[PDB]
Amino acid sequence: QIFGRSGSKYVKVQDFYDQLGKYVLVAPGKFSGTVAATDLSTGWTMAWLAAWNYGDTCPIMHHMAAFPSPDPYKEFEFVVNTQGGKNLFIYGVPVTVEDPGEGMKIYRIKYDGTRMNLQRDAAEVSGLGLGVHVTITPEADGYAVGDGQKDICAEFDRETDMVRYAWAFDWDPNVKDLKRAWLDGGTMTIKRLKPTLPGGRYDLQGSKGNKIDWELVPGGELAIEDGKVSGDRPLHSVANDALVFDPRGKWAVASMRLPGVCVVFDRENQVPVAVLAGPKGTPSQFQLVKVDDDTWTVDIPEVISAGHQAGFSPDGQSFLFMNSLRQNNIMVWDSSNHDDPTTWEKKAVVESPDWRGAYPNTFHMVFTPDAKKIYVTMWWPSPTPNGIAVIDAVNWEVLKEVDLGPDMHTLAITYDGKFVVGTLSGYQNTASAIVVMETETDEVLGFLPSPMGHHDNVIVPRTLEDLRISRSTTT
Amino acid sequence: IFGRSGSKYVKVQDFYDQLGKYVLVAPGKFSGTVAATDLSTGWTMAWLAAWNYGDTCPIMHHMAAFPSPDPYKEFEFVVNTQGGKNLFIYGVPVTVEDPGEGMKIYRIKYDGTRMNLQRDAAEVSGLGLGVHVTITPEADGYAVGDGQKDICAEFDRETDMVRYAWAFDWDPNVKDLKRAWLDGGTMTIKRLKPTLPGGRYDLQGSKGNKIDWELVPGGELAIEDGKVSGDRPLHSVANDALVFDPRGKWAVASMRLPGVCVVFDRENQVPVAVLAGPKGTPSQFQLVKVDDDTWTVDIPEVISAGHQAGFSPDGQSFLFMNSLRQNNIMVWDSSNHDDPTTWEKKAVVESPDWRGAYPNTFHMVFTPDAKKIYVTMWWPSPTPNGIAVIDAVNWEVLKEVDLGPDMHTLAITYDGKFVVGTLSGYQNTASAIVVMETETDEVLGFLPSPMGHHDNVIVPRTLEDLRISRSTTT
Ligand SMILES: [Cu+2]
Ligand SMILES: [Cu+2]
Ligand SMILES: [Cu+2]
Ligand SMILES: [Cu+2]
């Protein structure tokens, strides 16, 4: 140890890192314009990258996901997207760039044991730019991006960065009044999106395709209803969030925020197979109707609540969709039947008197490796302290809530199940940190500095199995 | 005291509890950001990204913080930037054509929640300067130096207007970049007066530049080999900083290339002494007054470039590192506050591992009782950079610790207990905050810092604190 003259020992922070293991945390920084990998075994930032260095004129570094690497310390690859345009104006920061870049870039970056290397922009390769959740396929042979301004999600080939398939979603509201457009129901169309360009390419880079000028914020479903969200076709919006993956392969689920549904897709045969109904009180599913070989519809009598967070248990047994704002809860499906998602039926709802209000919103989660516990974020607007709720995933009950500080975002877990590692991001202008909480008795062990506005974080997985509790099955 | 797991798990909050209630602030160089960090909780308190404010080459560079009675409620600070071809000088494969010109001097106020960009004092005064930033010992102003333009100036805190500016020019004996300094020359020290309405300078951005980028450590060899582009490289002296004597009255401008520091009378606006850097030269060179606005000093040969420069917190010693051809710490007796002409060379700190070149000792900080100094040791990749502990009574190296790549600045908590510095991955690799306890001079470890920091401070509370902050040394 290190002793004073008094024989009292100094605290070495290295002692704190010793216990965490050999794990590499990565996180983008939103308005900071940077992305950073951290060695949780030493406290060092291993390498960071500033997209402005590459001529990016709106480097709002947004979602990300890391491919497994046998040894992350020697190398790993990862995907990180950006947003642009009026997403720049939506936080508490008096930005002065009135005409910023359009974003929707999808960067491929490789850490090489020393530095980050920006490989290319896959949105340029494919011509498809998408700016919300990034996930890796369970096979680690590609990745997926959702976007809630264009309402397009797509799975991409890891090697080529070419779109394997893309789905576009559209809203036909029963009542063409923004106030009632979702409440009073409507019909959502699912359309196969095909390349319109030479070389198998799309012509949907940057803001091409945008229905609204920014991604809705938490509870922003109120704001688009209230006419506060500008764009060409807000009545047509469904706010696609993510395409998450069944860890057993075959199925991918696209979350649609405004109509409160998730669409299960056959990855191989590239068709939709089921629509899951979010709000408590609705059946397990809504009816999928084929119109033609490229087009399907689903009618929703009414939208009781918006939904947001979506994903699978590591064993593929359960599927989860969070209702948010008008109901705050966790809706749970039995997805044990890997053969037929039309059989998936609701089996539980995690609820709490504490979720009475319009907040908190439960918009990120991570499961323990053994699928018995979930850690779920609790977000509020300033100044309410944000935190984590620990969920019993066997009985479907809230074990515990802890307060942390402002603007809680994502949660990752060391692959041995021992430590949850999360990010708080200051609403882009105030306090921000990495938080560490041990999963045995669920005690917060403290904070590490992180001067970034993280809307995502991952721990680099070693294996296909690690990926089941990484940015692949949940967001 | 304990939860359910008893003492099973290490809480990082213990680590911070011993550090006390101090706020670390640092700029991020290529990160384009600047950040304040609470050493008592491990939170970043606030961060600011200059690209948000239309900055197109946001190389956030040096900074200094004004004292505040409670830095957790509010504090003010000054951070400048670099631009043009300073963008192209590190390992990053940048793809920016027509980068911003930089040399902005941002005023930023932390208001207990957020950072607020107040203005660019370079736009206010018309004078942009891209190297060291310091606070006056009275905290009523600040100063900035520049080694591309060879200008330094002290500014009023309220108005952001120049109180005085100095321009420095080299007349080399031999008109050959190879010999322009080895073979000596005359350096001119000239009052710099404004040209524009309202007493404004016409020197923003890259206006005034002799060379296209600030000299890297050991980079005086690059300018000699004429691998530094620019209009007037033979005229370069590479001013580094303007530091302050904590007792007041005097400020000292460090000149890298001709190996000297110039002492200036602040209030009367005259240079009063030239301190000669290399071991082997006299205590001073002779100051010659040509008219009320112009002085010259002759330097037969330049034995070595110098860099770090500063005062002990009581003002008793003044130091200038030799840092190219010699590698040592040159020390002067500056106890005579009345007259800088009397200041005499009193010691040279030497070490067997200091040959050249590297390590480059370009930052330092003292303990509050002036008994010890902490000195960076910089090397290019892949040599381990680290810290040197200096005995400031006997003038010898106590200890050297290895840390990691690319060591930059060092600050100290104001009770004397913890040195906090930054390492910066040459802007593309590993970076961190380092904490070292001063009692036995041992490294407590590192904290994450995804930034390229070329500066960092602990926000001072009082004028006394400022003596060991970014005021007396760099
Ligand atoms: Cu989301
Ligand atoms: Cu976001
Ligand atoms: Cu310097
Ligand atoms: Cu620098």
DSSP letter string, A138-162? TTSSEEEEEETTTTEEEEEETTT--
> From CA B152, how far away is CA B143, in angstroms rounded?
7
Query: In A, which residues are within 8 Å of B33 by CB distance?
Result: 32-34, 451
Q: Distance from B27 to chain A by nearest Cα, in Å?
A: 11
Does the distance separating the beta carbons of B51 and A97 come in below 8 Å?
A: yes
- Mutation site for A-interface testing, chosen from B51, B408, B417, B435 by largest number of A Cβ within 10 Å: B51
> From CA A20, how far away is CA A389, in angstroms rounded?
21
CA dihedral A402, A403, A408, A412 (to 10 degrees): -30
- First and final CA of chain B: distance in angstroms? 41
| CB-count burial class (<10 Å; 0-12, 13-18, 19+) for B291 | exposed
Pairing of strands B407-412, B442-448: unpaired
Selection from B382, B424, B376, B431 nearest residue B401 by Cα: B376
Which ligand has its closest atom nearest to the C-alpha of B86? 4
Residue contacts between A and B (CB atoms, under 8 Å):
210
Residue B45: domain span: 1-474
- First and final CA of chain A: distance in angstroms? 41
Distance of CA A92 to the CA centre of its chain: 22
Q: Is A120 labelled as part of a ligand binding site?
A: yes
The two three-digit tokens of residue A240, written as one number: 């696609």
Answer for the pair B424, B404: CB distance below 8 angstroms, yes or no: no
Handedness of CA A58, A60, A63, A69 (dihedral sign): positive
Please enumerate, by residue number, every residue of B annotated as part of a binding site for Cu(2+): 14, 29, 61-62, 97, 119, 132, 160, 214, 235, 240, 307, 323, 337-338, 363, 406, 408, 454
The two three-digit tokens of residue A79, written as one number: 């995907």
The two three-digit tokens of residue B97, written as one number: 């054509």
Selection from A185, A344, A322, A192 nearest residue A264 by Cα: A344
What are the C-alpha distances in Å from A306 to residues A209, A239, A334, A361, B454? 23, 10, 21, 11, 47
Name the residue in chain A with its Cα closest to that of B440.
Answer: A4
Which residue of B17, B91, B446 is in closest CB contact with A43?
Answer: B446
Q: Distance from B435 to chain A by nearest Cα, in Å?
A: 9
Does the distance separating the beta carbons of B51 and A59 come in below 8 Å?
A: yes
Does the distance separating the beta carbons of A96 and B52 come in below 8 Å?
A: yes
> From CA B14, how far away is CA A274, in angstroms rounded?
51
Query: In B, which residues are within 8 Å of A16 by CB distance?
Result: 10-12, 15, 445
Q: Distance from A447 to chain B by nearest Cα, in Å?
A: 5
Handedness of CA A69, A71, A75, A80 (dihedral sign): positive
Does the distance separating the beta carbons of A43 and B451 come in below 8 Å?
A: no
> From CA A351, how far away is CA A346, in angstroms rounded?
14
Burial of B206-217, coded b for 16+ CB within 10 Å and e otherwise, reads bebbbbbbbbeb
Q: After which residues is chain B broken (C to N over 2.5 A)?
A: none
Which residue of A17, A92, A432 is in closest CB contact with B47?
Answer: A432
> From CA B159, how far away is CA B162, in angstroms rounded?
9
Give the experimental resolution in Å. Answer: 2.0
CA of A62 to the centre of ligand 2 (A): 6
Answer for the pair A34, B33: CB distance below 8 angstroms, yes or no: yes
∠ CA B259-B263-B266, rounded to 5°: 145
Does the distance separating the beta carbons of A52 and B96 come in below 8 Å?
A: yes
Give the residues across from A376 on adjacent strands: A365, A389
> From CA B452, how far away is CA B32, in angstroms rounded?
9
E strand intervals along B284-395: 284-285, 288-291, 294-299, 306-311, 317-323, 327-333, 344-349, 364-366, 372-377, 385-391
Does the distance separating the beta carbons of B449 and A12 come in below 8 Å?
A: no
Query: In B, which residues are within 8 Å of A116 by CB distance?
Result: 428
DSSP A463: S
Report the number of distinct structural domains present in chain B. 1
Conformational region of residue A442, where left means phi above 0, alpha means psi within -120 to 50, and beta covers everything else: left
CB atoms within 10 A of CB A74: 11
Q: Distance from A60 to chain B by nearest Cα, in Å?
A: 10
Which ligand has its closest atom nearest to the C-alpha of B146? 3
Q: Distance from A55 to chain B by nearest Cα, in Å?
A: 5
> From CA A123, how far away is CA A129, in angstroms rounded?
5
- Spatial CB neighbours of A94, under 8 Å, sequence gap ≥ 6: none
Backbone angles phi and psi of B306, in degrees to 5: -125, 170
Name the residue in chain B with its Cα closest to that of A18.
Answer: B10
Method: X-ray
Does the distance separating the beta carbons of A114 and B450 come in below 8 Å?
A: no
∠ CA B238-B241-B245, rounded to 5°: 140
Does the distance separating the beta carbons of A449 and B42 come in below 8 Å?
A: yes
CA of B29 to the centre of ligand 4 (A): 7
Which residue of A13, A46, A431 is in closest CB contact with B447?
Answer: A13
> What's the count of helices (H) and strands (E) in chain B, helices before strands?
4, 32
Q: Distance from B417 to chain A by nearest Cα, in Å?
A: 11
Q: Which alpha helices (DSSP H) does A218-284 contain, by range?
A: 220-225
> From CA B53, how far away is CA B49, in angstroms rounded?
8
CA of A150 to the centre of ligand 1 (A): 15
> From CA B331, how far away is CA B348, in angstroms rounded?
6
For ligand 1, a single-atom ion, which residues have Cβ within 5 Å? A 241
DSSP A17: H
Name the residue in chain A with its Cα closest to that of B110.
Answer: A430
> What's the count of helices (H) and strands (E) in chain A, helices before strands?
3, 32
- Spatial CB neighbours of A181, under 8 Å, sequence gap ≥ 6: A171, A173, A175, A225, A235
Q: Distance from A171 to chain B by nearest Cα, in Å?
A: 34
- Mutation site for A-interface testing, chosen from B2, B8, B29, B31 by largest number of A Cβ within 10 Å: B31
E strand intervals along A301-440: 306-312, 318-324, 329-334, 345-350, 365-367, 373-378, 386-392, 397-405, 408-413, 419-425, 432-438
Answer for the pair A471, A135: CB distance below 8 angstroms, yes or no: yes
The two three-digit tokens of residue B32, written as one number: 């384009």
CA of A106 to the centre of ligand 2 (A): 14
Q: Is A454 labelled as part of a ligand binding site?
A: no
